Amino acid sequence: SGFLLRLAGPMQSWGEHSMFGERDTLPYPSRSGLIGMFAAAQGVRRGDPLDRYKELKFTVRVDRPGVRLVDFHTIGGGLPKERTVPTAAGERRDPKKATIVTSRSYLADAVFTVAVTGPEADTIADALAAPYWQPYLGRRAFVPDPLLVLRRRVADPVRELVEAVPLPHRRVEEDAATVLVDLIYETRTLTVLNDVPLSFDSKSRRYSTRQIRVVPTEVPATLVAGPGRDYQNKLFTYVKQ
Amino acid sequence: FRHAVLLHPSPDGSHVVDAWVTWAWRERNISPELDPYLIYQTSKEGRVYPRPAEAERAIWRDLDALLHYGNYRPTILDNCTPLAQVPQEVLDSLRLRAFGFDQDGQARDKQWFTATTPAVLRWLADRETDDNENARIVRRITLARKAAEALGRRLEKACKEAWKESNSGPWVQHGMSRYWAKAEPVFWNIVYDRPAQGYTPGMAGPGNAFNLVALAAYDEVTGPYCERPRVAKVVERHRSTLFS
Amino acid sequence: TFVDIHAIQTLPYSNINRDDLGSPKTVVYGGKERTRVSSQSWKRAVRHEVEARLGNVSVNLFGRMLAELPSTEVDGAVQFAHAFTVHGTTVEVDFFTAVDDIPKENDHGSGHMNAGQFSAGTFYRYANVNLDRLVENTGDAQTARTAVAEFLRAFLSTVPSGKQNATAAMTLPDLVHIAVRFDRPISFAPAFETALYGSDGYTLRACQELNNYAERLREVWPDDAIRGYATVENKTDLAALGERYDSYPALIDAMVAAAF
Amino acid sequence: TFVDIHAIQTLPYSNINRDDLGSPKTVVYGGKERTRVSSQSWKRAVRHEVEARLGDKAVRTRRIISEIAKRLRERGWDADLADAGARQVVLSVGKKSGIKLEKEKDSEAPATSVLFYLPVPAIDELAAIADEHRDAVAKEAAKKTPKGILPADRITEVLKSRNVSVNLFGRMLAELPSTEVDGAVQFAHAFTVHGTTVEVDFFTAVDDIPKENDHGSGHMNAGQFSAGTFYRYANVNLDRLVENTGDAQTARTAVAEFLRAFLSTVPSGKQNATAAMTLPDLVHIAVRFDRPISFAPAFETALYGSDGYTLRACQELNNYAERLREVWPDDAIRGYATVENKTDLAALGERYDSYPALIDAMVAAA
Amino acid sequence: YILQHADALVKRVSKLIVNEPAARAALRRGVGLAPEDPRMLAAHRVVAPYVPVVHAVERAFYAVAAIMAAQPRSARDQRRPNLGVSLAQAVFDKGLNADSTEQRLHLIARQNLDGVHRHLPRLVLYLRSDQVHIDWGILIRDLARWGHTPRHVAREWVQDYHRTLETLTRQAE
């Protein structure tokens, strides 16, 4: 069982621990987000039991860490006072203060290839191919790369993360081999953060911590693609086989 | 407490239904002796205040818990963590955690974050089990942390001073955001000795690795405004300070 | 059933969106920085335009009213990608000075010196419409049908209002391609993961490059997707995008016809 | 309800609009650098010709206090009372204590922080309002920190008065958001159809008295100039201009006068050294009802060169206008006027013999 | 790497100006114009063997050899700094005007490769006219990299200039 999910695209955000106007992303995908991505693909209404998703495992290798950028993002500004965001008391604030100013962060030009291994993950892959709601990378405005699922069915996909999945253009030294790539596994634990989603109900979303261990591993330098456009070519060669 | 709360219960006791938040004191009193936990700071006029949380340092996950590898240090840590204390081995496996709530001192609030130190940094020291490559790892890591922070303040003050001068600040926010975002992988490359630009594996110290990231973030931020010669002169005067 | 629409609309010297500072918004993508027009800004103009022409489908096509309290449907189903330039773009500073009309025994002590940033380029836009949930939530397939058609026309016709009086950036897209897909929505954004080089323009080259990406994706995954495109250029054929149409509203009509 | 006007106009070695370092402003558009004339400059030239031709002038000034001071001084006020009364004019209005003022300059009244934009007779009416309350002003002039005694409503009503230029281009005042007027005109940055490298001219100002021994230039430098066929575009939102002026007849004169100013005026940038005065080679007024459309994408692919760009630019704007009318069908009343007779240019609508005939026909059509 | 061919060109040509007049006079008639221009056909005998194999590198080599031979007789007679370091040295020592030469440097920093060549010979001969030192190999390498750098070299030029002026002023205390 298992399939390869490729998270790529111009921008993707995987925030955790932010609860005000400023938003912040983890430099790598968060299990909560990917689980919600599958739940959205399967029609799981907000508030439905998320234990079906329990028992999955997410090893994620970071091809390009990507640049982290902060996207300004106002809400309601430049509108007449009557048509701005409501207050909790119900009376709209004065128009010179009715604007909301959020500073949301997002990863741009970053690409990870998570190898999801679970009990029903093959039905989940078959659900991403025909989604109930549009899958997106973190914020809904970010739209996933068309090669969202590199392979629908793979026996031992981590074995395919160690090798035989192409890689972006990187420095390849003379007489070099085995270019270093950071794999992320789920003592030797990088960080602890609230990921595993106890409930997605918008009224009270709650989570619990998951330790992450990031192990730099060594994959053959043959894997990295040539400088220009070759990455797309090798990747497409990869999807048909 | 300066704040006084009363929570109206639900009949079963399962939930709170109403709440009353209100003052308990009209006259404020100086609380004697500085709080051990917080990191303090003295500012011209000699007034002593706790260093405010900054959500930009939370961009690089768990940077404050690296406090142990260190000028000014919290007193509780400085009593219990060091070697004058009394435990024997305990200190080897203790690891620090910090809770920070960056917000306005008024009613605005921005960001909170927890931060336990990574267990990989000390465990990478014990994989080897030798007196020297280990003390060298620890020395490197302590050294890396010192470089990242010194140039973090150098870059804050750089952007802050330049922005004020150029108009005769918003540059600080993006400066620090870009700084820790770029300064995070170079640190992890210096610890593993992997090759990071501005660093040569096996060098005795950070090697200017950090000074390069700060310059790239600063030049990333002040980039579009170094056009006019008057403003370019100011911006150059203050990037030159990051040269070390 | 997912109706998605790609447009390659170019914009002259303009500053449609800007940061907390004056400079416009940029993605760093494909290693080359490129200006962008954020999704919410563009969405706001489209939603305002749809609600103005249409006279609660705006809470259905678009998830919820900003100034109304949540009515248990905050999701809009419609997905708006953030528009980004086909090529890498350097931010172009425009130094300006407001003139003081009253003259002292002094000349040109100008009223106000400053410099504002602008940029120009060919943005590659893209959107999606979750048709099935829109029908299940709206109820009547007809209101949904009119709403979907008008939403596509709004996506095409409009341009954001930002610094528009100083730069008349009003423009029509060069290419639109509406693909009624049943498998899943897909954006051709990776066609431009390698920013095109300059000096000969980008409209035509971006058109055939997106044609190459449509051939390849159509090759790996052959689908029952109904497609069609309309261009302001008759010089080049793009067979992979589907049957060509004489115009944009004729195209929108044929694809709205194709969804039902 | 949207009148948009396109225009191709060649300028010979002009350098009408300079950046901060003296080089003409450039757009890297279509991948190729193209010199441009900023919109605010040609817009300023248009508003001054419109005010000069329509007779009413508006004044964008940072020094309103000094001007009110000359009017109060000509009304018989003492100079010190005139200065204190004009300070009362700006002190009596706004949310905060008063309109914020720049740091005080010796011997002269301080300039306001923001640029006021109001017609001239309205400034004189502000002087009359400060005049009627002369004794109250005299009493507050004796105090150390005088407060805004004048009625705020009367002054705000004077500051809301609109000139034709205010009706047409709009204004902004941050302290008084009640006075802000939405502009009815979108003015694009005029860029070249073709790619232009910045031409450098090396000049030496000659000393006139002969030197006894060493004769050399008095000063020598190099100023940058450029030439080319600019594309120009502009919109007029008739609904907003009618909303601003109120009556459709003054909006009609404002639109016709604007279009004529758009064709006639030139920014005047070193015109005493280049004489760049020129009429546009082609003009195309469309009266569209759905939305305005600039033909700037038509010239995104820069023209190659070696041959006169005018004929190819007019023909290319023709092909793009044809292709857009086919792609985006509309009932918009079109019309054009051209100097060249080598081509019919069928897509640009009905041809008119002269620019005033074209303007009168399309304004009468709207 | 190019700095090597650049130093070989600087040496041979630096000798060529002093010893043989017909060669430098064959070089100076090609200042500020592209090598395809017929006035440059006489300079190929001297410059063509030294260029490797973009026109940007050729324009850098050919042009710096031409500017090098167009020095006034006085200048020709008589860490590695950039042209910006040479600028700051001409401001602090030789007393050039400051507000104008800084303006002229920030005027060069915006051009494209086509424009730098147009502006450079007047500036460099100005600098050279009063015995300001300019290391031609660095200028060559830089002019070759101007073509593919948007501002990556110019920023180095501007930063070094401002920095060297500040240090030269602080050392005078």
Side-chain angles (χ1 to χ4, degrees), chain A, chain B residues 1-80 82-85 87-141 143-192 194-244, chain C, chain D, chain E:
Chain A
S1 66
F3 69 97
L4 284 182
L5 227 200
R6 160 218 188 44
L7 305 152
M11 46 188 108
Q12 27 155 306
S13 153
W14 305 102
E16 180 254 339
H17 91 61
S18 210
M19 290 187 181
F20 294 104
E22 172 164 15
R23 308 310 223 165
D24 182 25
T25 69
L26 286 158
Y28 24 76
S30 78
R31 167 181 190 122
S32 168
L34 275 71
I35 284 186
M37 184 186 184
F38 304 152
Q42 297 188 351
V44 171
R45 281 246 169 151
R46 288 237 202 45
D48 289 335
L50 285 179
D51 285 330
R52 24 194 315 188
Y53 290 107
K54 176 80 170 168
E55 295 187 338
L56 286 292
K57 281 179 290 300
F58 293 100
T59 64
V60 185
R61 62 181 196 88
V62 312
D63 308 346
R64 246 184 326 219
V67 205
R68 167 214 229 76
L69 297 164
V70 54
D71 163 71
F72 205 55
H73 183 78
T74 59
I75 295 144
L79 275 171
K81 179 231 182 64
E82 306 56 7
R83 295 222 285 116
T84 59
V85 180
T87 320
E91 300 83 349
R92 337 315 209 44
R93 300 161 124 208
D94 295 334
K96 186 174 69 158
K97 309 181 177 68
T99 308
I100 308 181
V101 180
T102 60
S103 194
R104 309 187 174 182
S105 303
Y106 69 100
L107 296 173
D109 198 76
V111 54
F112 308 98
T113 50
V114 53
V116 50
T117 298
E120 71 197 0
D122 299 335
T123 76
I124 297 178
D126 185 74
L128 288 170
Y132 193 87
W133 295 297
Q134 295 91 18
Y136 51 87
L137 279 35
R139 275 69 159 277
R140 182 185 186 86
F142 304 154
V143 170
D145 173 81
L147 277 46
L148 183 51
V149 286
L150 296 183
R151 294 287 186 85
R152 295 178 60 258
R153 302 81 170 83
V154 169
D156 190 14
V158 193
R159 179 58 171 79
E160 207 183 353
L161 289 191
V162 289
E163 289 94 2
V165 164
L167 260 94
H169 182 61
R170 223 208 258 46
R171 232 171 270 322
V172 195
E173 295 78 12
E174 294 95 323
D175 193 338
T178 71
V179 66
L180 276 173
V181 171
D182 193 348
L183 273 152
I184 291 186
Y185 295 159
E186 198 178 359
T187 81
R188 193 190 31 191
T189 78
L190 180 70
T191 190
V192 62
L193 34 79
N194 310 116
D195 269 12
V196 45
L198 276 63
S199 183
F200 276 145
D201 183 25
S202 58
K203 295 187 61 61
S204 63
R205 304 148 75 242
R206 297 175 295 104
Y207 301 99
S208 292
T209 61
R210 61 94 163 262
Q211 294 186 350
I212 63 159
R213 64 181 64 86
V214 296
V215 173
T217 62
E218 210 184 349
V219 306
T222 301
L223 252 307
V224 325
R229 186 63 75 79
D230 213 71
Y231 183 71
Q232 219 182 347
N233 291 345
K234 298 179 66 71
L235 249 304
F236 277 113
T237 296
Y238 181 98
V239 181
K240 306 167 263 85
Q241 302 170 346
Chain B
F1 299 98
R2 307 211 282 270
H3 259 263
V5 188
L6 180 58
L7 54 86
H8 187 263
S10 60
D12 185 28
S14 308
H15 302 298
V16 177
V17 180
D18 287 335
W20 292 275
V21 189
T22 313
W23 66 270
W25 297 92
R26 298 300 306 281
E27 314 170 342
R28 188 64 280 271
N29 197 338
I30 181 105
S31 178
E33 295 93 12
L34 295 291
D35 197 333
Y37 294 109
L38 311 176
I39 300 186
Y40 284 130
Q41 276 182 346
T42 65
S43 75
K44 298 191 291 183
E45 186 183 16
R47 59 173 199 262
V48 181
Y49 68 97
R51 192 175 80 234
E54 293 187 352
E56 64 262 20
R57 302 173 59 88
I59 206 104
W60 159 357
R61 248 280 229 300
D62 67 53
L63 171 76
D64 301 329
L66 295 194
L67 195 305
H68 234 334
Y69 290 95
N71 198 341
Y72 191 73
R73 296 175 190 183
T75 81
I76 177 172
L77 63 89
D78 269 349
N79 284 323
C80 316
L83 277 299
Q85 216 244 96
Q88 70 290 348
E89 185 267 343
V90 164
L91 306 181
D92 300 330
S93 190
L94 75 84
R95 61 175 185 174
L96 183 57
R97 179 178 54 195
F99 299 115
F101 184 67
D102 181 12
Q103 57 181 340
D104 196 349
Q106 305 277 114
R108 296 185 182 89
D109 303 329
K110 182 166 64 177
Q111 190 64 285
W112 63 43
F113 52 97
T114 69
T116 77
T117 196
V120 300
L121 290 199
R122 70 67 183 280
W123 176 83
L124 288 173
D126 308 326
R127 216 115 102 318
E128 34 145 43
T129 62
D130 298 334
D131 205 339
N132 53 334
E133 181 175 347
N134 176 20
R136 288 184 62 180
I137 287 184
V138 164
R139 209 36 202 288
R140 307 240 307 280
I141 294 192
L143 283 240
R145 165 199 204 270
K146 290 225 121 105
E149 302 215 316
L151 295 75
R153 295 185 300 270
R154 42 183 328 130
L155 187 54
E156 70 101 10
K157 202 191 74 78
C159 288
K160 161 182 155 75
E161 284 229 278
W163 186 95
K164 99 177 47 162
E165 249 200 90
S166 289
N167 292 341
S168 64
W171 287 1
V172 180
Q173 181 177 0
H174 302 287
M176 290 305 127
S177 183
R178 337 223 64 187
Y179 177 64
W180 298 115
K182 294 176 180 297
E184 158 85 336
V186 69
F187 175 85
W188 289 115
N189 288 338
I190 289 181
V191 63
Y192 278 62
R194 286 200 261 185
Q197 205 159 50
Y199 178 61
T200 163
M203 180 133 163
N208 263 60
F210 292 106
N211 191 307
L212 253 61
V213 179
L215 287 175
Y218 179 86
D219 287 342
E220 301 265 26
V221 172
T222 195
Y225 306 123
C226 204
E227 285 309 323
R228 251 171 325 169
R230 161 206 76 126
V231 187
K233 176 179 286 184
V234 172
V235 165
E236 291 300 334
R237 168 162 34 235
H238 294 293
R239 68 181 293 274
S240 68
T241 194
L242 278 65
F243 279 150
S244 179
Chain C
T1 309
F2 294 148
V3 200
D4 54 354
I5 162 170
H6 314 57
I8 300 196
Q9 177 179 355
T10 171
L11 294 171
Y13 194 79
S14 55
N15 191 5
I16 288 197
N17 284 123
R18 55 169 167 287
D19 290 331
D20 64 336
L21 311 168
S23 53
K25 295 187 153 76
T26 68
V27 190
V28 61
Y29 180 63
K32 285 171 77 174
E33 284 187 353
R34 52 190 70 192
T35 178
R36 70 164 159 111
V37 188
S38 182
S39 155
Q40 67 283 7
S41 172
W42 256 114
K43 196 179 170 159
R44 164 183 199 164
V46 178
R47 70 166 301 150
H48 184 278
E49 170 67 23
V50 172
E51 295 180 343
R53 180 185 294 95
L54 266 185
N56 211 331
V57 205
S58 28
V59 190
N60 213 318
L61 52 118
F62 305 111
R64 95 120 137 138
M65 286 308 70
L66 71 86
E68 307 299 331
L69 297 179
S71 73
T72 69
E73 176 70 26
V74 292
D75 255 331
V78 169
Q79 178 156 26
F80 243 82
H82 285 208
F84 65 107
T85 26
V86 164
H87 59 281
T89 64
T90 189
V91 180
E92 296 167 357
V93 177
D94 168 76
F95 173 82
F96 66 89
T97 59
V99 181
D100 200 352
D101 271 335
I102 308 316
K104 308 274 303 185
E105 296 286 331
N106 183 0
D107 277 329
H108 317 91
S110 176
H112 180 68
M113 293 179 48
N114 206 14
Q117 298 74 15
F118 298 166
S119 50
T122 301
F123 298 154
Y124 159 70
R125 324 185 34 213
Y126 173 77
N128 188 148
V129 180
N130 195 343
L131 180 143
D132 295 333
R133 271 55 157 178
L134 200 63
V135 175
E136 292 178 353
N137 296 330
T138 306
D140 289 333
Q142 290 304 319
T143 69
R145 176 161 166 130
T146 80
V148 179
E150 291 298 331
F151 168 81
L152 272 42
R153 179 184 189 86
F155 181 89
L156 292 191
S157 61
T158 47
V159 162
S161 63
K163 289 288 283 293
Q164 282 298 125
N165 300 123
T167 77
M170 287 294 142
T171 314
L172 279 176
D174 305 333
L175 208 156
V176 311
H177 171 219
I178 303 187
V180 177
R181 307 202 47 102
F182 301 96
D183 60 339
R184 57 185 185 91
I186 65 190
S187 66
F188 295 158
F192 313 135
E193 193 273 330
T194 63
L196 302 189
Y197 302 145
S199 182
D200 189 71
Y202 302 102
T203 64
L204 178 66
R205 306 186 51 203
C207 293
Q208 58 210 22
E209 179 76 12
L210 185 138
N211 186 36
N212 293 339
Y213 196 74
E215 67 183 3
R216 284 165 171 165
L217 281 179
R218 181 185 184 171
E219 187 273 347
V220 173
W221 289 285
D223 188 74
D224 184 72
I226 307 173
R227 288 184 290 263
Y229 68 117
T231 318
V232 178
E233 77 236 7
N234 310 322
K235 177 259 182 70
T236 40
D237 203 350
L238 311 176
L241 299 171
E243 287 80 51
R244 173 83 150 283
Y245 289 62
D246 288 335
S247 153
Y248 295 159
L251 194 162
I252 295 177
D253 286 332
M255 297 309 160
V256 169
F260 333 65
Chain D
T1 63
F2 286 102
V3 179
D4 52 331
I5 172 166
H6 315 256
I8 307 289
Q9 174 168 358
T10 83
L11 293 166
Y13 216 93
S14 48
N15 179 5
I16 46 188
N17 202 17
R18 297 179 287 175
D19 70 341
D20 187 71
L21 298 173
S23 54
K25 295 174 179 179
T26 61
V27 188
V28 185
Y29 175 61
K32 186 178 294 183
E33 181 185 356
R34 305 178 189 190
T35 177
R36 65 164 166 92
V37 179
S38 59
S39 75
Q40 60 270 358
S41 75
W42 217 301
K43 176 182 302 185
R44 176 184 181 268
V46 164
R47 72 172 282 263
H48 276 295
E49 123 106 346
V50 161
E51 290 166 357
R53 189 174 169 86
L54 204 56
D56 52 342
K57 294 184 180 225
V59 167
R60 178 185 307 277
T61 184
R62 211 178 48 187
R63 309 178 177 99
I64 194 191
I65 297 173
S66 175
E67 196 56 12
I68 297 180
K70 22 174 65 178
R71 303 187 182 90
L72 293 182
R73 190 172 298 103
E74 62 93 355
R75 292 180 177 267
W77 287 59
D78 181 70
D80 294 338
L81 283 182
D83 188 354
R87 290 178 177 268
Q88 295 298 326
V89 179
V90 301
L91 207 53
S92 59
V93 351
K95 40 184 71 181
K96 289 170 167 186
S97 75
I99 296 294
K100 293 183 284 180
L101 304 176
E102 204 71 5
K103 285 298 188 62
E104 179 66 9
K105 302 288 179 180
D106 49 15
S107 187
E108 52 189 11
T112 64
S113 292
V114 70
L115 292 300
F116 283 92
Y117 189 50
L118 40 103
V120 182
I123 200 176
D124 185 23
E125 296 212 3
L126 291 176
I129 299 178
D131 187 25
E132 71 181 352
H133 303 283
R134 181 172 185 172
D135 41 9
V137 170
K139 292 180 180 300
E140 296 289 325
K143 296 183 177 179
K144 297 179 180 175
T145 60
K147 299 181 178 55
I149 304 300
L150 293 334
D153 222 340
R154 300 257 320 266
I155 298 183
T156 309
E157 292 300 326
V158 168
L159 301 178
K160 287 180 182 180
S161 65
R162 297 179 180 90
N163 189 334
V164 174
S165 298
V166 178
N167 295 322
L168 208 50
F169 300 109
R171 82 170 72 186
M172 168 177 169
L173 191 55
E175 292 83 352
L176 292 170
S178 56
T179 65
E180 293 181 353
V181 179
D182 354 335
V185 158
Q186 302 177 341
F187 217 95
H189 288 267
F191 60 93
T192 53
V193 172
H194 61 279
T196 62
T197 184
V198 169
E199 266 156 35
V200 182
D201 175 73
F202 171 75
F203 62 87
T204 71
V206 72
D207 233 310
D208 260 350
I209 278 103
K211 193 54 185 306
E212 289 187 351
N213 198 341
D214 56 25
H215 52 60
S217 67
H219 173 60
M220 44 191 293
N221 198 14
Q224 294 90 351
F225 296 98
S226 160
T229 71
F230 294 161
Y231 169 75
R232 307 173 43 197
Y233 172 76
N235 289 331
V236 177
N237 194 338
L238 292 181
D239 294 339
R240 286 179 182 170
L241 184 57
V242 169
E243 174 177 358
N244 288 334
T245 59
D247 32 270
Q249 190 64 40
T250 62
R252 190 177 189 273
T253 63
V255 172
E257 186 59 36
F258 168 80
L259 266 56
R260 178 184 176 85
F262 178 85
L263 298 189
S264 175
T265 199
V266 166
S268 66
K270 301 178 68 63
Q271 288 296 319
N272 292 130
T274 57
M277 296 294 172
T278 293
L279 289 179
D281 213 29
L282 177 145
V283 78
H284 172 276
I285 306 181
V287 179
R288 312 219 35 211
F289 303 98
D290 51 341
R291 65 176 301 274
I293 303 173
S294 76
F295 296 160
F299 312 105
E300 166 280 346
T301 66
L303 295 187
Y304 287 169
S306 194
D307 296 333
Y309 299 119
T310 56
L311 182 63
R312 298 180 58 183
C314 300
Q315 184 175 343
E316 190 70 13
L317 190 146
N318 179 24
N319 295 333
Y320 189 80
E322 176 182 359
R323 201 46 198 174
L324 280 185
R325 76 181 302 177
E326 180 181 7
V327 170
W328 190 259
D330 48 337
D331 333 344
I333 313 172
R334 291 173 180 85
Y336 76 104
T338 304
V339 165
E340 62 194 357
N341 199 342
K342 284 77 177 184
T343 310
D344 183 28
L345 304 176
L348 302 180
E350 190 185 352
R351 183 171 178 180
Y352 292 90
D353 295 331
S354 53
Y355 293 158
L358 167 65
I359 294 174
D360 286 339
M362 300 304 121
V363 170
Chain E
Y1 161 71
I2 302 181
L3 197 139
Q4 292 186 344
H5 295 170
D7 282 343
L9 252 192
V10 170
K11 292 172 184 178
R12 175 186 177 83
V13 175
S14 68
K15 171 188 292 186
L16 209 64
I17 297 168
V18 190
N19 289 321
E20 68 180 340
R24 62 169 164 98
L27 280 183
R28 69 178 175 87
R29 290 189 301 269
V31 175
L33 42 90
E36 297 73 9
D37 181 23
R39 293 77 68 81
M40 203 69 182
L41 91 152
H44 298 308
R45 183 186 59 86
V46 176
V47 183
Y50 290 158
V51 307
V53 175
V54 193
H55 300 281
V57 186
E58 300 183 351
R59 290 293 296 278
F61 277 142
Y62 268 112
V64 180
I67 299 173
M68 190 174 179
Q71 291 174 2
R73 137 63 107 41
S74 304
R76 70 165 59 97
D77 251 2
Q78 63 92 98
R79 49 175 85 184
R80 246 148 116 42
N82 298 311
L83 188 136
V85 183
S86 295
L87 280 174
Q89 198 69 261
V91 178
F92 177 75
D93 283 336
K94 304 292 185 299
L96 292 184
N97 187 21
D99 292 329
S100 68
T101 195
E102 177 188 357
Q103 181 179 353
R104 268 178 215 271
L105 164 84
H106 289 274
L107 184 143
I108 295 300
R110 299 173 179 177
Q111 303 296 327
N112 53 26
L113 172 60
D114 198 334
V116 179
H117 286 293
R118 292 175 174 263
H119 286 285
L120 196 71
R122 189 177 315 108
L123 171 51
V124 178
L125 291 69
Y126 186 71
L127 289 185
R128 289 302 303 166
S129 187
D130 43 331
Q131 291 290 328
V132 183
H133 182 274
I134 293 180
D135 187 336
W136 300 102
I138 302 297
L139 175 64
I140 289 176
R141 161 168 75 47
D142 293 333
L143 290 187
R145 301 190 294 110
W146 183 249
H148 75 274
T149 48
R151 294 200 65 193
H152 185 70
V153 64
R155 293 298 287 162
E156 303 185 331
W157 270 26
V158 171
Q159 295 169 345
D160 288 334
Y161 169 89
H162 292 289
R163 180 183 65 191
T164 298
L165 187 64
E166 61 86 12
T167 63
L168 286 184
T169 53
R170 295 177 177 182
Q171 295 299 319
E173 53 64 274

